[PDB]
Amino acid sequence: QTFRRLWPTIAPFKAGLIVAGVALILNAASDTFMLSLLKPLLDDGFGKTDRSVLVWMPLVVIGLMILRGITSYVSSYCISWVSGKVVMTMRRRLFGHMMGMPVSFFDKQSTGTLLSRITYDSEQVASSSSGALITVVREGASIIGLFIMMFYYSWQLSIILIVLAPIVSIAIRVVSKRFRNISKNMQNTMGQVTTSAEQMLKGHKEVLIFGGQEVETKRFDKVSNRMRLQGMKMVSASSISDPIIQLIASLALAFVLYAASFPSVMDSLTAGTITVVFSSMIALMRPLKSLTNVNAQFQRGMAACQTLFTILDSEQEKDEGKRVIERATGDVEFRNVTFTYPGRDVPALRNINLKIPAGKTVALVGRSGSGKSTIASLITRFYDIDEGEILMDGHDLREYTLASLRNQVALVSQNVHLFNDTVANNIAYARTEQYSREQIEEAARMAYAMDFINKMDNGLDTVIGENGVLLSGGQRQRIAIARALLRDSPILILDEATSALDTESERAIQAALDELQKNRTSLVIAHRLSTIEKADEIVVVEDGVIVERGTHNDLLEHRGVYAQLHKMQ
Amino acid sequence: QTFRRLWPTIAPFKAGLIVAGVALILNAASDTFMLSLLKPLLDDGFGKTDRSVLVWMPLVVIGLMILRGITSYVSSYCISWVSGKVVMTMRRRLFGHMMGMPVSFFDKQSTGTLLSRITYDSEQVASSSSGALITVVREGASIIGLFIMMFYYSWQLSIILIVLAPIVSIAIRVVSKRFRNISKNMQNTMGQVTTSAEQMLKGHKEVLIFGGQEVETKRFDKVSNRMRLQGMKMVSASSISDPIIQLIASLALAFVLYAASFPSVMDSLTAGTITVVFSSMIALMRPLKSLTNVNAQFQRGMAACQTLFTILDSEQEKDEGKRVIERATGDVEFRNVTFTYPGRDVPALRNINLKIPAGKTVALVGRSGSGKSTIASLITRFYDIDEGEILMDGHDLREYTLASLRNQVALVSQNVHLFNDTVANNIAYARTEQYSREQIEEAARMAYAMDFINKMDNGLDTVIGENGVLLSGGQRQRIAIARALLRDSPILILDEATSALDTESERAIQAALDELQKNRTSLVIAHRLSTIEKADEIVVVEDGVIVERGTHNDLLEHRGVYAQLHKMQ
């Protein structure tokens, strides 16, 4: 169905398919013709000469279905490798859906969407490989059991099991429907086990540090019991499906009783051998069980790949296209640009038409919490949606090829999202192309005895707590400055990094980058006097509105806000 | 084996066990006695009177094994519910292993250890339920097929299939061994898929904000291909196991050829009916396939519950026991206490014997990054290991019942670990017992127009980005102060929370808590003049050593460090 758009994937796939199918074909050859042993065997009194070739053949056929063992295995390996590689493909590509998602909403929720990957993934693997393989094995045996019976034995007897097979068919049909539905929406509901995992992330150290130890327990209570009884729900749904196929195997098998009874009532036939055919009948219902269980388990397979295609696709929006911006610095000017993240809530910026040149490194100012941060995601184009619009350098903000554009600017956030790392990465990361640890060594050392860890330089291969845990804030803070010591891009901007820092390496890095980078606009906020005197221009934009700008020295008298800023401290 | 310590879990379990077992017993009754239909059926020429009761019975037996359908289902539901509830139990309890782990090492790594839960969990469920249930169904049919053959038919024929069954036994034995081993260490190796998920967490927004878009791809390259070819590795290992049981079903089934041949060579018997018994032989090898696949899949089951018991247990260390500390404030004094997190690296604190009373709220000072933070985890007893030792109030730090002890102090970290939240939690969380939103309303409002979000108070039910994303830093910072507006405990301490804050609500909360809490020692660091004048005592402890303390006013001349601190800014 949708399975038909599963179908395009690739051709060598088709090869493994044919491999397994013909394999089962050769499961069937000696199960049916197995009956073509027992069949003439049993009737003829074996005589001796008949007993001769008879007693001879089991050696042969036994070599034959043990052969069917190895062949079966072959096809198993091949198709398995096929299936696996398919999973591989999806996992990456739809990871290109999730990275393909990115930030604007992908802000909202994180690790629920995460576990989509791992645990909307693995069980779909198992269901795919296991389920599919076990399904295939079945119906060749069943089918052949029918056909051999039908024409290869008897025609009104054909009418018999072909009374079964259409009706049987519609049975698998309705089962496939009701159940593909129910357990489909099930795994939809189990994505809330992914919720569970997500929240139990959010445990981490926090409750531990308040001493709230029993609310966790409550958390796994509400969701865990719900989802676990949920599992039992669909297990009972499964063993409910096994009857509905069994009750049609009860009416179907029962119709073999009619087959058992009706010629028995009036036999135009010789029972004789064809009695043997009934053995197949027994064998026929033997795989029955598996299917239900299988299908249930396998139903999973169709289902999340389903939701991954469907629910997984959207929004890597675009770029009009260009080059990179050269390191030649543009000028940052916007027109009537304002936004707020939520909804009907009015834009957090009141409104603004940006203007600055580059080479003017201006002190940005506003009382915090103000969406003062927004310009970043704005200017970094985290948000394309623009009330008012931007052509920077006579060409619009969104005409600029994505990374190449973003190769205009780097930044330090209000805070740090970092890795477990040695010197290896979050310094050397920014663009790994230069990892040179001469160049990295002293390049980070351009944060000037951030090279110094405490009375030490770290065993430079020693990895860190992901956000830095293993020591107090300063050094990692300085790292968060250090990522910008490397990549240079036609404009750079930094903010609020100084949190626990000393004033020393702070200011020395101020003038240091000044010297280094004069001619980019470098924009920043401070609660300290640090840049607010020395930034070659000053601007105070508070909340979503600019109160003032120009040279701060004008603004100590011109307003009281900056005055008191200094005047207090 | 270890399965024998799986065994203690509970009794109603035993009930469901008996349920399923006797169930399969009644699968078997009419498969064997099914042969006890075909058997006398086929030989006797049916006559009519023989044909009468014969053609009669299929109605009966067909009602009987369709009965076996419903019975089978019953036992399925019951045992399933059993298995599920067992999983539930573990998931919580060993979550009490992981919380049972806590911080000291549990610092080191987070979300790899995480996915242990979800994806060392779910597949173990599937393997448990599915695998176990499918296993049980098998050997009752096999066994009975043997026994009915052995004594219920023929004794030297007993010798036949009991030539099989011991040898067959040792076959399942070696399979169980080699494979329990190999796929056991496999899932050990797949816990590195949990690694994968963990790192792809660490993608989140960071690379996105640098523009490093192709290193991710590399990350799923190295691990993803490895683990996926790893899956194929154990799939091929499985379909390698199916032969080794098939080659002993090739030698075993082949020994049925001997059974087929040897009496055929010289028959002391009447073949006749007992020819029919061979049908069972065919049916016998029919379940064969499943086991291998099953066992492989099921092997998973033993395995992580294995590693969960084993690898999951340790360290909720202890408490000597006491009451809570009363809100009556102790005095914080240590003896020769110093530590550093890493290894052979010498303690980050040089050494210290703490002393302060409570009611003295002292300005703690040191250049940051210095392990200045450590005292927290120290004093909060995140680290029991103490070079030098502590009896605070003549009774040791570790004599104090855990939370109750920690009910002496609350704190704001150097940073924020928070939730998606409305007003609902991270303010109201601290101890949910008072969520009172009068009391919460103005209790958080004790952060004084932190009540104010921007020109607004949030729709007070509006949840936030987990770390607060939806607006700039200030308000959530103030929240991180607000968690301490509620819980009071015989001492409180706060640090570095003011990061983007204004000075206004900062200082007003300073004196506000002063007024409110005088008589606890309240200890803090600042890069601002804020508390450094007004903290009723002053201490500068830099790096792992105390340089100075007393009244700062003594220390502006007495050292230059504080002087310049002010004197610069």
3-class secondary structure for A382-445?
Answer: CCCCCECCCECCCCEHHHCCHHHHHCCCCCCCCCCCCCCCCCCCCCCCCCCCCCCHHHHHHHHH
Q: In what order do the strands lie in the sheet with A545-550?
A: A362-365, A537-542, A545-550
| CA B501, chain centre distance (Å) | 38
**Six-digit token string for B56:** 């009669």
Q: Are B499 and B473 a contacting pair, CB within 8 Å?
A: yes
- Give the C-alpha separation, B67 to B370, whole Å: 75
- Give the C-alpha separation, B498 to B414, whole Å: 10
| Residue B323 CB neighbours (<10 A) | 9
**Three-state DSSP class for residue A539:** strand
Sort out which chain B residues have CB atoms less than 8 A from A31's CB and list them: 282
- Give the C-alpha separation, B204 to B209, whole Å: 10
Please count the residues of chain B: 569
Phi and psi, residue A356, nearest 5°: -155, 150
Q: How deeply is A108 buried, as exposed, middle or buried, from its count of CB atoms within 10 A (0-12, 13-18, 19+)? A: middle
Residue in the block written with tokens 């990350």: B219
Q: Which residues contact B354 (CB under 8 A, 6 or more apart)?
A: B332, B333, B334, B335, B337, B375, B390
Whole-angstrom CA distances from A345 to A222, A340, B358, B438, B456 are 33, 7, 47, 26, 11
CA of A567 vs chain B CAs: smallest distance (Å): 11
| Residue A297 CB neighbours (<10 A) | 22
Contact criterion met (CB < 8 Å) for B247 and A529:
no
Q: Which residues contact B308 (CB under 8 A, 6 or more apart)?
A: B90, B94, B97, B120
Helix (H) or strand (E) holding A327: none
Q: Give the CB-side neighbour count of residue B166, counting CA atoms within 13 A.
A: 5
Whole-angstrom CA distances from A329 to A332, A397, A490, A534 are 9, 14, 5, 21
- Give the C-alpha separation, A173 to A181, whole Å: 12
- Give the C-alpha separation, A207 to A197, whole Å: 16
- Give the C-alpha separation, A449 to A457, whole Å: 9
The annotation status of A224 as a binding-site residue, yes or no, is no
Strand-pair category, B545-550 with B537-542 = antiparallel
Phi and psi, residue B387, nearest 5°: -70, 125
- Give the C-alpha separation, B185 to B170, whole Å: 22
Helix (H) or strand (E) holding A362: strand A362-365
- Give the C-alpha separation, B341 to B318, whole Å: 20
Q: Which residues contact A115 (CB under 8 A, 6 or more apart)?
A: A191, A193, A194, A197, A198, B118, B197
Contact criterion met (CB < 8 Å) for A137 and B289:
yes
- Give the C-alpha separation, B311 to B184, whole Å: 14
Q: How was this structure determined?
A: cryo-EM
- Give the C-alpha separation, B39 to B42, whole Å: 6
| CA proximity to A10, closest of A72, A98, A81 | A81
- Give the C-alpha separation, B122 to A297, whole Å: 13
Strand partners, B365: B540
Whole-angstrom CA distances from B432 to A212, B276, B428, B439 are 8, 73, 6, 12
Whole-angstrom CA distances from A310 to A6, A91, A112, A304, A305 are 12, 15, 17, 9, 8
Sort out which chain B residues have CB atoms less than 8 A from A38's CB and list them: 278-279
Residue in the block written with tokens 């042993």: A37
Residue A295 one-letter amino acid: N
**Six-digit token string for B222:** 């190295």
Strand-pair category, A537-542 with A545-550 = antiparallel
Breaks (C-N over 2.5 A) in chain A follow: none
- Give the C-alpha separation, B84 to B13, whole Å: 11
Q: Which residues contact A255 (CB under 8 A, 6 or more apart)?
A: A160, A163, A164
Phi and psi, residue A363, nearest 5°: -80, 115
Our CA angle for B286, B292, B293, nearest 5°, is: 100
| Residue A113 CB neighbours (<10 A) | 18
| Residue A337 CB neighbours (<10 A) | 23
Breaks (C-N over 2.5 A) in chain B follow: none
Comparing CB atoms, the residue among B250, B290, B372 nearest residue A66 is B250
| CA B503, chain centre distance (Å) | 44
**Three-state DSSP class for residue A365:** strand
Best of A44, A368, A462, A486 to disrupt the B interface by mutation (most B CBs within 10 Å)?
A: A368
CA of A557 vs chain B CAs: smallest distance (Å): 20
Q: Are A157 and A252 a contacting pair, CB within 8 Å?
A: no
Best of A219, A223, A239, A240 to disrupt the B interface by mutation (most B CBs within 10 Å)?
A: A239
Q: Are A84 and B235 a contacting pair, CB within 8 Å?
A: yes
Q: What is the 3-state secondary structure (H, E, C) of A202-249?
A: HHCCHHHHHCCCHHHHHHHHHHHHHHHHHHHHHHHHHHHHHHHHHHHH
Q: How deeply is B11 buried, as exposed, middle or buried, from its count of CB atoms within 10 A (0-12, 13-18, 19+)? A: exposed
Whole-angstrom CA distances from B405 to A85, B50, B137, B398, B517 are 54, 87, 55, 9, 19
Sort out which chain B residues have CB atoms less than 8 A from A203's CB and list them: 99
Q: What is the 3-state secondary structure (H, E, C) of B533-558?
A: HHCCEEEEEECCEEEEEECHHHHHHH
- Give the C-alpha separation, B364 to B361, whole Å: 9
Whole-angstrom CA distances from B247 to A68, A504, B168, B408 are 11, 77, 11, 69
Helix pair angle (B271-285, B226-265), 10° resolution: 170
Q: Are B396 and B333 a contacting pair, CB within 8 Å?
A: no
Q: Are A375 and A550 a contacting pair, CB within 8 Å?
A: no
CA of B108 vs chain A CAs: smallest distance (Å): 6
Q: Are B140 and B28 a contacting pair, CB within 8 Å?
A: yes
A1-313 has which fold?
ABC transporter transmembrane region fold (1.20.1560)
Report how many Cβ contacts below 8 Å link chain A to chain B.
426
Helix (H) or strand (E) holding A255: helix A226-265
Comparing CB atoms, the residue among B117, B373, B431 nearest residue A197 is B117
Q: Are A58 and B261 a contacting pair, CB within 8 Å?
A: yes
The annotation status of B314 as a binding-site residue, yes or no, is no
Best of A113, A210, A379 to disrupt the B interface by mutation (most B CBs within 10 Å)?
A: A210
Strand partners, B90: none
- Give the C-alpha separation, A235 to A238, whole Å: 5
DSSP per position, B112-162: HHHHHHHHTTHHHHHIIIIIHHHHHHHHHHHHHHHHHHHTTT-HHHHHHHH
Helix (H) or strand (E) holding A73: helix A49-98
Residue in the block written with tokens 């200890």: B523
Whole-angstrom CA distances from A240 to A188, A233, B112 are 20, 10, 38
**Six-digit token string for A407:** 């190769």
